């Protein structure tokens, strides 16, 4: 019973400009997820740092599954992210050879 709301790297309805505040100046493989710019289908947007730029990868949501491209194979956003911590996004696009290495946490350090 994992909830996306508890994910360190899930920042909800923040904007791309707000994401850039968190990803600017970071290392390759730094990442967070926000809601997509539009609510259609309940998609999400992964933002991943590479080469000093922010790469945005749509997380499609269809029929209760999630993925970057068809076929959608993941049962939750958390499961998707956990997969790409270990497997490079070269699986999505051969030219995007980066893993999800450094989550940007929304929580205070306490």
């Amino acid at each position: 019973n994992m909830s996306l709301q508890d994910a360190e790297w899930y920042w909800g309805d923040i904007s791309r400009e707000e994401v850039n505040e968190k990803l600017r100046d970071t290392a390759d493989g730094t990442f967070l997820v926000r809601d997509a710019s539009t609510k259609m289908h309940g998609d999400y947007t992964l933002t991943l740092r590479k080469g000093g730029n922010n790469k945005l990868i749509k997380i499609f949501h269809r029929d209760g599954k999630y993925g970057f491209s068809d076929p959608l194979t993941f049962s939750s956003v958390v499961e998707l992210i956990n997969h790409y911590r270990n497997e490079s996004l070269a699986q999505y696009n051969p030219k995007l050879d980066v893993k999800l290495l450094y989550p940007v946490s929304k929580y205070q350090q306490d």
Binding site: K55, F68, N93
Partner: peptide
Amino acid sequence: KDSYVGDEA
């Protein structure tokens, strides 16, 4: 720059 990444080349 913020860029969407597509699945084609």
